[PDB]
Curated annotation (Swiss-Prot), chain B:
InterPro entries: Ribosomal_uL13 (IPR005822), Ribosomal_uL13_bac-type (IPR005823), Ribosomal_uL13_CS (IPR023563), Ribosomal_uL13_euk/arc (IPR005755), Ribosomal_uL13_sf (IPR036899)
NCBIfam families recorded: L13_A_E (TIGR01077), PRK06394.1 (NF005004)
Subunit structure as annotated in this protein's UniProt entry: Part of the 50S ribosomal subunit.
GO molecular function annotations of the record: mRNA binding; structural constituent of ribosome
Keyword presence, Ribosomal protein: yes
SUPFAM superfamilies for this protein: Ribosomal protein L13
Cellular component per GO, a single term: cytosolic large ribosomal subunit
Name under which the protein is recorded: Large ribosomal subunit protein uL13
The species this protein was found in: Methanosarcina acetivorans (strain ATCC 35395 / DSM 2834 / JCM 12185 / C2A)
GO BP terms, alphabetized: negative regulation of translation; translation
Gene name for this UniProt entry: rpl13
Function: This protein is one of the early assembly proteins of the 50S ribosomal subunit, although it is not seen to bind rRNA by itself. It is important during the early stages of 50S assembly.
Family named by the database record: Belongs to the universal ribosomal protein uL13 family.
Keywords annotated in UniProt: Ribonucleoprotein, Ribosomal protein
From Swiss-Prot, chain C:
MF terms in GO: RNA binding; rRNA binding; structural constituent of ribosome
Protein name, per record: Large ribosomal subunit protein uL4
Basic and acidic residues bias locations: 44-51
Portion of the full-length sequence here: 52 to 102 of 253
Alphabetical keyword list: Ribonucleoprotein, Ribosomal protein, RNA-binding, rRNA-binding
CC per GO annotation: cytosolic large ribosomal subunit
Function: One of the primary rRNA binding proteins, this protein initially binds near the 5'-end of the 23S rRNA. It is important during the early stages of 50S assembly. It makes multiple contacts with different domains of the 23S rRNA in the assembled 50S subunit and ribosome. Forms part of the polypeptide exit tunnel.
Phylogenetic classification of the source organism: Archaea, Methanobacteriati, Methanobacteriota, Stenosarchaea group, Methanomicrobia
Family recorded in the similarity comment: Belongs to the universal ribosomal protein uL4 family.
This protein's record includes keyword Hydrolase: no
UniProt organism field: Methanosarcina acetivorans (strain ATCC 35395 / DSM 2834 / JCM 12185 / C2A)
One of the GO BP terms on file: translation
Subunit structure, as described in the record: Part of the 50S ribosomal subunit.
Biased composition (Basic residues): 31-43
Region (Disordered) residue spans: 27-51
Keyword rRNA-binding: yes
Length: 132, 138, 51
RNA sequence: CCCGAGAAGGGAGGUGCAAAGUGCCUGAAACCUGAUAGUGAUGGAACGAUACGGCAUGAAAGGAUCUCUGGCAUGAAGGAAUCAUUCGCGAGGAUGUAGUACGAAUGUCACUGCCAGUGUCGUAUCUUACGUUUUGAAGAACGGGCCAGGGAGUGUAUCUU
RNA sequence: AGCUUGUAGUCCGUAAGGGAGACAACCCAGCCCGUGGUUAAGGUCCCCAAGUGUCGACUAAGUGUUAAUACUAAAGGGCGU
RNA sequence: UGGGGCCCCGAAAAUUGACGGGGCUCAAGUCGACCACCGAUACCACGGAGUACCGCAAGGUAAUCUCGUAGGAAGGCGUUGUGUUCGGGUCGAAGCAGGGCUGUGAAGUCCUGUGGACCGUUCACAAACGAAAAUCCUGGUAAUAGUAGCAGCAAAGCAGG
RNA sequence: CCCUAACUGGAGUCCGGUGAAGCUUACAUUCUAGUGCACAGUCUAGAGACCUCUAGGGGGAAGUGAAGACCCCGUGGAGC
């Protein structure tokens, strides 16, 4: 429960990334829907005659660095608070809640995750995953 | 309601097609057999007899014989009728030969630019004569 | 001779199957690195000098 | 205990933290059966990409000055409508109004509770699959019915950088 | 000969997007992403966004409505106009 | 009589059909000019990403950077294991089906359900290290399909119990 | 054969039981013309087309069977 420490330049960059990553395509592999053997991850087109590798606008969008998010707000949570994957209670003593927010480890049991959330609530660090 | 007496077939068809693609009005085209087609009568009848006896019997173009259905066909050509816009436009178009009973006393509007007296020759035949020479009864 | 002590030979063409080596008395493929039970193409050698 | 002709099998019931219920750990896809959502017996095909809508979902992990609707301030590129004058055979042009009102976006104040997303369908534009041999592939050229797993620059010696 | 063999330039191969109905190499154009604007080629009767546009003539044959082109018929003739 | 524009005859092909189609006649055709508009990812502008070189660094410049096959170069993602640092787990590990978020992406992380015992990470290092395809190999399984066959050379069965 | 007809038994058709295989990247209700490696159900422009099922014989899918056995090439073989 704290105000996000983001200056108006970074607020504009955050909204810019919101719009531009709303418009960003999913970058599925070519012909992934046709065959059930194929996955949803990106593989570079390689055939000499393939229409995606030839950059047909009707066939999709090629993976390329022009689509990248703004450099300042890159890697930030959609809430804006930066993410720190917390895999232990000792990682709460090297993060400050003024502009960040933790993410508790998936394999953590209730016994130590309860202690983690208690220490975060007393310290003030924002937590993305929890229960209520 | 369009009175197609003394109007060019293609110009009337293009005007009605654009009006129906505006997309609100049901257009009735009475007196469809009195529409005009420019050109010599021999060439007009030659083209229409070639187009009449064209297709195959299982597949081919079953080009109509009635004057109202020929005018409907010509307006069908200038529409995207295989699309939903074209299908709605063709459902919102009715062509009649003569005056049907429900259109007696109704109000009509005729296209100025599609008039037949804008032409400058005697070379024309009516759509009714072409339908009649295609074997139609109307 | 892991995967290699077989005596398999290809069937040639004209049978609708691929050209890989197969057993002399059955159609089961053998001895090639992509056949089941075939030799590891480029496996480690005991004569390598890792030092 | 019941059905069943039945040492089959099924239901009820119990042991077991858990049926894990006799090739029985977890238990994928292909394939098959049923249910839910959308559409559907007037309908055009590389099954998708982009934009906008209908229906269903949207609990968690996504947003809460976030979603919807307006006012005000600054507004890059561009730039009117209307009216007046004058020219032009005419369609129209020039001048002024006016670089005005507007205008992407950047801020701020109200207003609102949905929005991002997911599934399917429709509408508008674009695309005749993938790999290979090819000068040229959607090819009436070759390979694949589908799914899972296995499947191709490795070592010794020697020379060079 | 959409044949074969050269040369200069530019292309496809390895070239998107926009337009020629579709078009490897013809025109604009060489192209990081999103938004706004204006133009290029080409088009503005409908299919299809924008002209049933203006001026001066021609064509009466549905000729034509086909830049380049492997996709488009000649010699000859016409008191057709 | 000569020189010109358009048109006509010359002009016959095999599935019905091609000005792209409808159609069009002072044109929706041809010729000589003209006006206004439409129309790209081009050009302009704004915001953003990457790259090139320079700068100690902040950062600076790019009209004179941004397409790409064979191919060269650089930087990263992933699997398995070793040394080493820091760890997670019956208050529920791996794996599996779906979904949210981040990243240009390789992929990572998170949530829901199931599960019943192991699993990662820092800095480095190795490899039996990544599949979509080889009429590829092994296994499972479709469509064909409740179809062909259950006939031809010896057509054999019916009543009662 | 002109010129086919009728009849018989077994199939087929229909029904009960049993019950495989071969083609298959995907979609697919097509027809014409053009274009495209010059032989297109999928492109382009038109024309048709409500869907499902049964029987039919085989027009098309350059139908399936199959790394062409004719011709050429290989500093490939064998026999003579
Ligand atoms: Mg073995
Ligand atoms: Mg090549
Ligand atoms: Mg594998
Ligand atoms: Mg050129
Ligand atoms: Mg080039
Ligand atoms: Mg092009
Ligand atoms: Mg390369
Ligand atoms: Mg595989
Ligand atoms: Mg029988
Ligand atoms: Mg061969
Ligand atoms: Mg030689």
């Amino acid at each position: 429960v704290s105000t996000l420490d983001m200056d108006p330049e970074s607020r504009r960059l955050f909204n810019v990334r919101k719009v531009q990553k709303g418009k960003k395509p999913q970058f599925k592999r070519t012909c992934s829907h046709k065959f059930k053997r194929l996955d949803d991850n990106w593989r570079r087109p390689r055939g000499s005659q393939g229409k995606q590798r030839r950059k047909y606008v009707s066939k999709g969008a090629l993976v390329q660095v022009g689509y990248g998010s703004p450099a300042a707000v890159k890697g930030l949570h959609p809430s804006g608070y930066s993410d720190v994957l917390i895999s232990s209670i000792a990682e709460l003593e090297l993060v400050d809640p003024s502009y960040e927010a933790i993410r508790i480890a998936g394999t953590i049991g209730a016994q130590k995750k309860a202690l983690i959330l208690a220490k975060a609530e007393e310290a003030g660090i924002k937590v993305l995953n929890s229960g209520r | 309601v369009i009175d197609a007496k003394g109007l060019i077939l293609g110009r009337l068809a293009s005007s009605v097609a654009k009006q129906l693609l505006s997309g609100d009005e049901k257009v009735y085209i009475i007196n469809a057999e009195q529409a005009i087609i420019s050109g010599s009568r021999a060439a007009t009848l030659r083209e229409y007899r070639e187009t009449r006896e064209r297709g195959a019997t299982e597949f081919g173009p079953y080009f109509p014989k009635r004057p109202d259905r020929i005018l409907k066909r010509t307006i069908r050509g200038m529409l995207p009728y295989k699309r939903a816009r074209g299908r709605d436009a063709m459902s919102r178009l009715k062509v009649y030969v003569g005056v049907p009973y429900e259109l007696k006393g109704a109000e009509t509007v005729t296209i100025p630019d599609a008039d037949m007296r804008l032409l400058s020759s005697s070379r024309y035949v009516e759509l009714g004569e072409v339908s009649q020479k295609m074997g139609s009864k109307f | 001779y892991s995967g290699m002590e077989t005596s398999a030979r290809g069937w040639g063409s004209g049978r609708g199957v691929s050209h890989v080596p197969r057993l002399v008395n059955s159609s089961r493929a053998a001895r090639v690195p992509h056949a089941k039970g075939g030799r590891r193409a480029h496996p480690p050698k005991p004569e390598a000098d890792r030092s």
